[PDB]
C-alpha cells in the first residue's frame, strides 16, 4: 500500500520475537527511511534516549527463595476498569507510518491481550474508527491542547461519544525537541491527521505552548472523566498536577524525544511515587523493553507500564497480530521474573523492595 | 561418538590452560552449536551474566609485606569431610552435551584433585554410576523437587545408597529464565535424563514451582543428611532457610541463567555472610574464573567456591584429565595470590580484610 | 587565498548545521592539516578535553509541567551592555588559520546575532580593523601581559581607542600545554600577529609567566575599564581575583589545551559561583556544544557562555555568515530547552535548580 | 648483537618522544617477541596493570591563577643526596633483553640527567660494572633475599664496595605472578644473571619466600645503610616496616606484575603517606607516564617517582641517550604542569592540594 509515494506495511501475522530491542533492526528493513528515523530518533545527541535503557541497571530484583507461590497473575484495574496486563500502549502519533491500518491494528492487538490503549490527537485514523476497531477494549484519549477551546471541546466530545474512560493531557511537547534524524531525512509527514481534518469540517507550534494548572481543572469539569497529566519528571510537578485536579500522573520523558539532558524516566519514578503516596494511580513509560524493566517500574511506584516504539515496530512487522505478539512476549518475560521473585499478583510486585547496589 | 545425531567429545588428556575464561572460545570449536549455546548462555540480555564477572572488581586484595609465610595450603573440611581444595564442582545438568562419558569423567577429575562434586537431578548418567566413577571422593546430590514425594523419596534413597554426604535443594529455577540462545538454536535435548528414566521404571515446568520452608525440614527429616538451600541472594532468605533446618547456604544466581536484572552473586555475598554469622557453612558460585576471584569469595564469607561452565568446557576438551586440568590451574592461581597476600591456610583467607576502593 | 603556502578559506554563506560537534569533521576537509591540529588539539592525552564534554552529564535539567510560559527570550546585559544572546565568542588567536578575513568575519557574525565578541592579543588582524568590522557590536579585549608595561599600556590604549567595553586578562597560559598534534605536524604559524607587528613600529615564553594580583589592580587603574580574570578553576582564586579589583570571573580551562589532569570546566563552576555569590558577573567556557550545555552553565552560576572551536570551524565553512549560523543554531537549541524547562527569560534559567543523579 | 640467538639493540641516539605510553608500540618493532612480552606483561587479566593508569583520573590538579611564580625547579634531595629531578629509575631485571649494554646504558642515561638509579639483584650486568658506568651518579641497590645469608652478605658487600647510598628490599615477589604473555611465548631468559654467576665463584622460587620484620633490622645492622621496603600497598605495612627499622617506604605493586586484583598503586598512596606522616621519605611507582601523573604522586605524599617500562623501551630505542631522552621528556611535561599549577619547587608540589571530583 502507498499514500503520496510512501510504502505502508499490509502484514497481518504473529511474529517470532527474540526480544523487544531486536524489533527495531527488523522493522528498519520494511519502514521507509524517513518514517523509521521519525520513530527511532531522540533529541540532540540522544543521551537521554540511551539513559532511559541504562537506568534500569540502577536497581536490582532479589531472587526470592522458598516463596511458596506458583502461576503468577498479570490482571489489574485502573479507575475500576479490569485489564489482563499492567502493560499498555503509550499514545503515539501517526501509526500510518508503520501500517496501512495504522491505529486500528494497534487497537485490535490491545483488545486481543485485554490491555489498555491510549489514542493520540495526532492519529492517522479518527477517534471513532480506532474505538470501533477495539470493540469494548478500554481506551484513553491523549489531548494536545489548542489556544482555541472550541477545538479542545470538539475532540473531548468525540472522545466521550467513543466511550474513552480517561483523558491524558500531554504537557512535555509545547515545542518539538531538536531531532537530528528528521533534519538529516528532510522528513515531511506524507499522510494526513484524521482528527484535525475532521475538526476542519465543523504542528506542535492553534498548539498551546502556554499550559497552566487551570487548564487541567477545565478539561476535568467539561469531560467529567479522570484527567492524567503526562510528561511529569519531578515530585513538585506531580503535587502541582494533583492540586489542579489530576486523577493520575504519567511519568514520562516522551521516550527521550523532547528535553535531551533531562534524567532517565526510571530515575525520577520512585521520588514522584513517594510524593504521590498512592493518592492517584501512576503510569510509567520511556525505555521499557524486558520483563525485569516492567517488574522494576511496578516495584518503584508504577501502577501501569506503557511502551511506544516496540509496538510501532510490531505493527509494521505483523499488523494487529504483530502488536498482539509484542504484548504476549513482554507478558511472558514478566511472568518469569514474577515467579523467580516470589510475586504472585501485580499488587505483590508493587510491594517488592528492589536492591540498590551501584554498577 | 554420536547420540541422536549429536557429536559428543571422546577426548581424555591433560589440557594446556592459559586461563578459565579462554576455555569457552576453545570449547566452541568442538561442542555442537546448540549444546554450546545451552552451556554459555544467560537470560534476557545477559547483563547479570556479565556483572557476575565485573563484580570481583568491587573489592581488592592487599599485597601483604613481611608476612613471614611460605608454601600456602589449600586443604579444608566441610561437615567434617576433608578436601584438598576449597574449589568444588557446581551441580550442572546434561554433561553428556560435552562428552560421551558425561558426569563420570567429571567425578574422576574431582577425585584426582581431592575436591567435592555436586551431582544434578538432571544428569546424563545416573546417581549410582557417577558415585561409582568417583570412588571414595566425597559427593553431594542436588535435588529438583517434584509435586510428587514418591519421586523425591526415590532419588533421596538412590543418593543415600550412593553414600552422598549432603543434599543441595535448588530453589532459584521454579521456571526457566528467558534464554535467547536456546530460542535462536531451537535447541531440544538430544540425549536422555538417567535419573528420570530410572524413576519411570518403579522440564522445569510433576517439577514443583511452589517451594516452602516446610519442604527443607521434610528432606532433612527423611534423609538425615545435611540440607543446603541453593539460589540465595538475600540475608532474609539465608535466615529463613537456617530457621527451616538448612545445614548450609549456597549463594548463587545460577550463573546468570535465571532472574536477569538481579545483582551479581559476589555483590550480595558479604551481607549474607554477616547475617549467617558462621552458624552454617556457605558455598558460593556464579562468575568465578581466576585465583583472585576465589580469594575474594573466601575473604567475603564463603567456605567453598564452585564453578560450572569452566569445568564443562574442560570436560569437552580433555574428559577426566581435562576436568582435572581445570581444578589444577585454578589451584595454581589461588596459591600465588595466597603467597602474595600472606595467607598460609584457607582459614587465613577467610580472616583477610579486602579493600573497598570504587573503580 | 594563500599566505606563505597556507590555503585559507574565502567562503561567505549560511551553513546547514546538524549540530556544533559535527562542524569539526566538516572543517577538517578544508582547513590545512597543521592548522586543523592547532585548533582541535588539547594537551597530554586530551583527557581534560574529553571530560569538558562528559561533565555536562553530571547534572540534569527537569522538564517543567504546567509552567504557563511561551516564547522564551534570549536577551541579557553585562556591565549595562545589552546582548540578544548569552552566547558569546571566546578570545581565540590566529583566526587567519580558518579564513582570509580572519577575526573580521567573526566580528561581523557576532554583530549579526547581537552577541559579544572577545578579541585576542594574538589576532591575525589588528584591534582597530576587528572593532571597525563589528561596527557598534560590543567587544572585549583579551590581554596577554608582557614583562614590558610599555607594551601592555600600548595595546590597552589601542583597545580604549577601539571602544572595547572590558579587558580580559588571561592567566592560565604562562606556558603552552604539551600539545601532541603540533609536535606531530611540526606546526609553525604561517601568518603574522597584527598587534605585535604594530607594537614593533612604535610565543607564550617579553610574555610574563609571573602574574600577580597587583597586575589586575594596575590594568584596572590604567584603563578605567572593568577587568575580568580568565582561567579560574577554584573558588579561592575567584575570591583572590575579586580582592585584587576584578569586575568579573571567566571560568575556563582554555578548552583543555593547558593543564591536562585538571578538572572539566563545568565541574568547578557551581563552587566558584557559590563563593562569588553574585558580587560580579561570571563568564563560562570549555566544552559547550548543545542548548542543554548552555542551559546547565547558566543554571550553575554563569551569566555568559563562550564558545571557541565551534565558531572557528564555522568561520572556515562560511566566513561571516558561517559564524552567524553557529550562534543561530545554538540559540535555537537553547530556546527549545528553555520552553520545555519553563524558563521564560535568561534570569529564569539562572534561578533553575538542576537535578544531580549519578550516571 | 646476538646472545644465544636473541637480537639485542645496539642503538645510541637521542629519540623523538611524542609521550612515554607511545614508546611501547615503538619498542615492539625492535625487541624480540618473547622479551617484549616479558617487559610489557602483567598478571592474570592485567586489570591491576590497567588501573595503575586509570587511577590518576581519581584526583585532579587545580590550575592556579595569579601565583606570581616563574621558571619552576626540579631539584630535590634524599638522605642528603642532591638530585636534578624527583623522577628516578625503578629496579628492573634483565635490561640485556632491550640492549647489548643493558644496565650500563641505563646508568649513563641517569647520570646525564642527574637522577637516581636503582640496580636489581637480577641484573644482566654486575653491581661493579653498573656503578662504574654511572660514575659519581648516586645509585641504590635492590636486594632479593636468599634463605642463605652468606649470599645476602656477599651482594651487600659488593653494593657497599660500589658506593650505593641505600638498599631496597623487594618483598612483593616471593612468587612470580601468573603472567600469561610468558606462558604464551614459552619464554626462557636467553642471557645470564651477572650477580648470581659472581656469587657462584666464591628464579623467584635458595629465593626466600618467608620474609619477616627481623630481616629488615638485620640488613640495616649489617650494611649500616638506609633500608627501604618496596611493595607496600597498606598503611599497616608501612608502619610495620618503619617499626622494624626501614629508613624509607617504596609504594609499588611491581607495575601490576604480581597480585592482580590488588588496588592501583596510586589509590593507596595518600593513606600510606598519612600513616607515615613524613617520618621517612616515600618512593612511588607503577603506571607513571605523564607530567600530571608525577605532579599528582608528589602532591599525594611521594618524595620520589620511579618508572620501569618506559625507560626499558627508551634503552632499546636509543641506549644511554635513549634513556636520557625519556627522563628529559617527563621532566618537560612536569615543568609545564608546575608552572600552570603555581608550584615553584618540588616542596611546593608536595604542599599542593588535589581536587577529588568523581569521573
Ligand atoms: C513515533 C512516536 C510518536 C509519539 N507520539 C506521541 C503523541 O502523539 N503523544 C504523546 O503524548 N506522546 C507521544 N510519544 C511519546 C510516547 O507516548 C511515549 O512516551 C514513548 O514512546 C515511550 O518511550 P519508548 O518509545 O521507549 O517506550 C510518541 C513517541 C513516538 C516514538
Ligand atoms: C549448563 C549448565 C547446567 C546447569 N545445571 C544446573 C542444575 O542442574 N542444577 C543446579 O542447581 N544448577 C545448575 N546450574 C547452575 C550451576 O550450578 C552454577 O550455579 C553456575 O553454573 C555457576 O556459574 P558459572 O557457570 O559462571 O561458574 C547449571 C549451569 C550450567 C551452565
Ligand atoms: C585555536 C584556539 C586559540 C585560542 N586562543 C586563545 C587566546 O588567544 N586567548 C585566550 O585567552 N584563550 C584562547 N583560547 C581558549 C579559548 O578562549 C576558550 O577558553 C576555549 O576555546 C573554549 O573551549 P571550546 O573551544 O571547547 O569551546 C583558544 C582556543 C583555541 C581552540
Ligand atoms: C621487566 C621488568 C623487570 C622488573 N624487575 C624488577 C626487579 O628486579 N626488582 C624489583 O624490585 N622490581 C622489578 N620490577 C618492578 C619495577 O621495579 C617497578 O615497580 C615497575 O616496573 C613500575 O611500573 P611501570 O613499569 O608501569 O612504571 C620490574 C618491572 C619490569 C617491567
TrEMBL record, chains A, B, C, D:
Q: Where does glyoxylate bind?
A: 38, 144, 179, 254, 257
Q: Which residues form the active site?
A: 254
Catalyzed reaction equations: a (2S)-2-hydroxycarboxylate + O2 = a 2-oxocarboxylate + H2O2; 2-hydroxyoctanoate + O2 = 2-oxooctanoate + H2O2; 2-hydroxyoctadecanoate + O2 = 2-oxooctadecanoate + H2O2; (S)-lactate + O2 = pyruvate + H2O2
Q: Where does FMN bind?
A: 91-93, 120, 142, 170, 230, 252, 285-289, 308-309
Source domain of life is Bacteria
Instruction: Write down the Pfam families for this protein, in alphabetical order.
Output: FMN_dh
Q: State the UniProt keywords alphabetically.
A: Flavoprotein, FMN, Nucleotide-binding, Oxidoreductase
What region holds the FMN hydroxy acid dehydrogenase domain?
12-359
The record, for InterPro entries, names: Aldolase_TIM, Alpha-hydoxy_acid_DH_FMN, FMN-dep_DH, FMN_HAD, FMN_hydac_DH_AS
Which regions span the lipid bilayer? none
The GO terms this record gives for MF are: (S)-2-hydroxy-acid oxidase activity; FMN binding
Q: What is its EC number?
A: 1.1.3.15
The protein's required cofactor(s) are namely: FMN
Q: Which PROSITE patterns match?
A: FMN_HYDROXY_ACID_DH_1, FMN_HYDROXY_ACID_DH_2
Subunit note = Homotetramer.
Family label: Belongs to the FMN-dependent alpha-hydroxy acid dehydrogenase family.
Record's protein name: L-lactate oxidase
Whose protein is this, by species? Pediococcus acidilactici DSM 20284
Recall the taxonomic lineage recorded for the source organism.
Answer: Bacteria, Bacillati, Bacillota, Bacilli, Lactobacillales
Amino acid at each position: 500500500t502507498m499514500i503520496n509515494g510512501y510504502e505502508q506495511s499490509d502484514r497481518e501475522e504473529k511474529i517470532d520475537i527474540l526480544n523487544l530491542e531486536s524489533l527495531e533492526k527488523q522493522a528498519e528493513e520494511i519502514i521507509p527511511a524517513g518514517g523509521f528515523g521519525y520513530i527511532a530518533g531522540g533529541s540532540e545527541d540522544e543521551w537521554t534516549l540511551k539513559q532511559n535503557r541504562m537506568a534500569f541497571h540502577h536497581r536490582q530484583i532479589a531472587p526470592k527463595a522458598l516463596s511458596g507461590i506458583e502461576k503468577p497473575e498479570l490482571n489489574t484495574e485502573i479507575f475500576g476498569i479490569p485489564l489482563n496486563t499492567p502493560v499498555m500502549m503509550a499514545p503515539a502519533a501517526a501509526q500510518g507510518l508503520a501500517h496501512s491500518q495504522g491505529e486500528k491494528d494497534t487497537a485490535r492487538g490491545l483488545a486481543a491481550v485485554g490491555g489498555l490503549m491510549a489514542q493520540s490527537t495526532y492519529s492517522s485514523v479518527s477517534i471513532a474508527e480506532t474505538a470501533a476497531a477495539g470493540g469494548d477494549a478500554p481506551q484513553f484519549f491523549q489531548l494536545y491542547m489548542s489556544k482555541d477551546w472550541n477545538f479542545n471541546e470538539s475532540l473531548l466530545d468525540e472522545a466521550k461519544k467513543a466511550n474513552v474512560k480517561a483523558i491524558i493531557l500531554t504537557v512535555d511537547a509545547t515545542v518539538d525537541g531538536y531531532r537530528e534524524a528528521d533534519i538529516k531525512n528532510k522528513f515531511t509527514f506524507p499522510l494526513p491527521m484524521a482528527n484535525l481534518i475532521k475538526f476542519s469540517e465543523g504542528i506542535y507550534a492553534s498548539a498551546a505552548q502556554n499550559i497552566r494548572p487551570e487548564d487541567v481543572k477545565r478539561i476535568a469539569d467539561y469531560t467529567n472523566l479522570p484527567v492524567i497529566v503526562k510528561g511529569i519528571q519531578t515530585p513538585e510537578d506531580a503535587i502541582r498536577a494533583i492540586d489542579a485536579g489530576a486523577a493520575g500522573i504519567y511519568v514520562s520523558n516522551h521516550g527521550g524525544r523532547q528535553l535531551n539532558g533531562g534524567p532517565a524516566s526510571f530515575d525520577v519514578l520512585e521520588d514522584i511515587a513517594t510524593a504521590v503516596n498512592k493518592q492517584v494511580p501512576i503510569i510509567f513509560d520511556s525505555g521499557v523493553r524486558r520483563g525485569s524493566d516492567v517488574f522494576k517500574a511496578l516495584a518503584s511506584g508504577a501502577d501501569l507500564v506503557a511502551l511506544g516504539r516496540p509496538v510501532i515496530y510490531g505493527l509494521a512487522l505483523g499488523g494487529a497480530k504483530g502488536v498482539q505478539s509484542v504484548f504476549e512476549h513482554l507478558n511472558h518475560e514478566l511472568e518469569i521474573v514474577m515467579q523467580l521473585a516470589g510475586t504472585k499478583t501485580i499488587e505483590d510486585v508493587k510491594n517488592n523492595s528492589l536492591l540498590n547496589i551501584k554498577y
